[PDB]
Design an enzyme around this catalytic site. Structure first.
Site, PDB file in Angstrom:
ATOM      1  N   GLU A  35      46.175  43.511  40.045  1.00 49.13           N
ATOM      2  CA  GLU A  35      44.907  42.933  39.644  1.00 49.13           C
ATOM      3  C   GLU A  35      43.763  43.590  40.398  1.00 49.13           C
ATOM      4  O   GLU A  35      42.711  43.865  39.852  1.00 49.13           O
ATOM      5  CB  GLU A  35      44.846  41.432  39.955  1.00 49.13           C
ATOM      6  CG  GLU A  35      45.633  40.531  39.025  1.00 49.13           C
ATOM      7  CD  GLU A  35      45.238  40.646  37.568  1.00 49.13           C
ATOM      8  OE1 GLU A  35      44.204  41.277  37.267  1.00 49.13           O
ATOM      9  OE2 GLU A  35      45.967  40.105  36.706  1.00 49.13           O
ATOM     10  N   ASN A  46      34.255  41.390  31.899  1.00 46.02           N
ATOM     11  CA  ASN A  46      35.019  41.307  30.656  1.00 46.02           C
ATOM     12  C   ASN A  46      34.075  41.422  29.465  1.00 46.02           C
ATOM     13  O   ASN A  46      32.866  41.239  29.543  1.00 46.02           O
ATOM     14  CB  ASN A  46      35.836  40.019  30.609  1.00 46.02           C
ATOM     15  CG  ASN A  46      36.827  39.890  31.755  1.00 46.02           C
ATOM     16  OD1 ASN A  46      36.755  38.968  32.570  1.00 46.02           O
ATOM     17  ND2 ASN A  46      37.775  40.813  31.830  1.00 46.02           N
ATOM     18  N   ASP A  48      33.673  39.588  26.938  1.00 45.15           N
ATOM     19  CA  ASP A  48      32.996  38.357  26.558  1.00 45.15           C
ATOM     20  C   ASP A  48      31.830  38.045  27.478  1.00 45.15           C
ATOM     21  O   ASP A  48      31.233  36.974  27.368  1.00 45.15           O
ATOM     22  CB  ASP A  48      33.981  37.196  26.553  1.00 45.15           C
ATOM     23  CG  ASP A  48      34.618  36.872  27.884  1.00 45.15           C
ATOM     24  OD1 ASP A  48      34.170  37.397  28.919  1.00 45.15           O
ATOM     25  OD2 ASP A  48      35.586  36.076  27.916  1.00 45.15           O
ATOM     26  N   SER A  50      32.154  37.453  30.568  1.00 49.80           N
ATOM     27  CA  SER A  50      32.697  36.858  31.792  1.00 49.80           C
ATOM     28  C   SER A  50      33.001  37.943  32.819  1.00 49.80           C
ATOM     29  O   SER A  50      32.903  39.136  32.526  1.00 49.80           O
ATOM     30  CB  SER A  50      33.928  36.013  31.481  1.00 49.80           C
ATOM     31  OG  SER A  50      35.071  36.805  31.225  1.00 49.80           O
ATOM     32  N   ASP A  52      35.784  38.943  36.254  1.00 48.93           N
ATOM     33  CA  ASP A  52      36.881  38.658  37.165  1.00 48.93           C
ATOM     34  C   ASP A  52      36.534  39.082  38.597  1.00 48.93           C
ATOM     35  O   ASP A  52      35.924  40.118  38.846  1.00 48.93           O
ATOM     36  CB  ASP A  52      38.165  39.363  36.732  1.00 48.93           C
ATOM     37  CG  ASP A  52      38.557  39.068  35.306  1.00 48.93           C
ATOM     38  OD1 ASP A  52      38.257  37.969  34.811  1.00 48.93           O
ATOM     39  OD2 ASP A  52      39.189  39.935  34.673  1.00 48.93           O
ATOM     40  N   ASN A  59      38.664  34.534  36.772  1.00 44.67           N
ATOM     41  CA  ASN A  59      37.633  34.667  35.759  1.00 44.67           C
ATOM     42  C   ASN A  59      36.586  33.555  35.777  1.00 44.67           C
ATOM     43  O   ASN A  59      36.864  32.370  35.952  1.00 44.67           O
ATOM     44  CB  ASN A  59      38.298  34.717  34.372  1.00 44.67           C
ATOM     45  CG  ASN A  59      37.306  35.177  33.316  1.00 44.67           C
ATOM     46  OD1 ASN A  59      36.772  34.363  32.568  1.00 44.67           O
ATOM     47  ND2 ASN A  59      37.058  36.480  33.274  1.00 44.67           N
ATOM     48  N   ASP A 101      47.977  25.036  35.628  1.00 40.86           N
ATOM     49  CA  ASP A 101      47.230  24.792  34.406  1.00 40.86           C
ATOM     50  C   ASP A 101      48.105  24.765  33.167  1.00 40.86           C
ATOM     51  O   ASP A 101      47.700  24.278  32.107  1.00 40.86           O
ATOM     52  CB  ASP A 101      46.143  25.869  34.296  1.00 40.86           C
ATOM     53  CG  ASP A 101      45.239  25.759  33.092  1.00 40.86           C
ATOM     54  OD1 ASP A 101      44.891  24.633  32.684  1.00 40.86           O
ATOM     55  OD2 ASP A 101      44.852  26.815  32.541  1.00 40.86           O
TER      56      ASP A 101
HETATM   57 XE   LIG Z   1      42.775  34.614  35.861  1.00 43.17          XE
END
Ligand SMILES: [Xe]
Ligand SMILES: [Cl-]
Ligand SMILES: [Cl-]
Ligand SMILES: [Cl-]
Ligand SMILES: [Cl-]
Ligand SMILES: [Cl-]
Ligand SMILES: [Cl-]
Ligand code: NA
Ligand SMILES: [Xe]
Ligand SMILES: [Xe]
Length: 129
Positions: A35, A46, A48, A50, A52, A59, A101
């Protein structure tokens, strides 16, 4: 801060991530490796809009507030900036909530594409744990 492997392993351990929701330490280290290459300061935008953040590339769409992700949620109750600290506590606390989640570590694309189903135990080999 740019962590060494065993070093990150040790810190994740101390923060309770070994076997958290059943994912062994090697999964977390692997995920961080791919990552962020272990770099607490990594950021990636990202499509969209967004972004990270940090060693586990959390995110801004759902987990942290960065003031520039319209309609986004902040389920970890944290400025995304907190996620870039050399102290990995905030990223670890937030990761625990993500893994819980519902889709486990599949939330980390690099984990499912590059760690999942591999011998992630290799990532902690040699380390004084
Ligand atoms: Xe994530
Ligand atoms: Cl490495
Ligand atoms: Cl492991
Ligand atoms: Cl960055
Ligand atoms: Cl926002
Ligand atoms: Cl730390
Ligand atoms: Cl799971
Ligand atoms: Na957000
Ligand atoms: Xe970025
Ligand atoms: Xe982390």
């Amino acid at each position: 801060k740019v962590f060494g492997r065993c070093e990150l392993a040790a810190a994740m351990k101390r923060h309770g991530l070994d076997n958290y929701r059943g994912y062994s330490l090697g999964n977390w280290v692997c995920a961080a490796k791919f990552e962020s290459n272990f770099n607490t300061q990594a950021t990636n935008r990202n499509t969209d809009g967004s972004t990270d953040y940090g060693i586990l590339q959390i995110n801004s769409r759902w987990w942290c507030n960065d003031g520039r992700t319209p309609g986004s949620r902040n389920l970890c109750n944290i400025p995304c900036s907190a996620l870039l600290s050399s102290d990995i506590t905030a990223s670890v606390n937030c990761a625990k909530k993500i893994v819980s989640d519902g889709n486990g570590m599949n939330a980390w694309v690099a984990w499912r594409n590059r760690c999942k189903g591999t011998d992630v135990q290799a990532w902690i080999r040699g380390c004084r744990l």
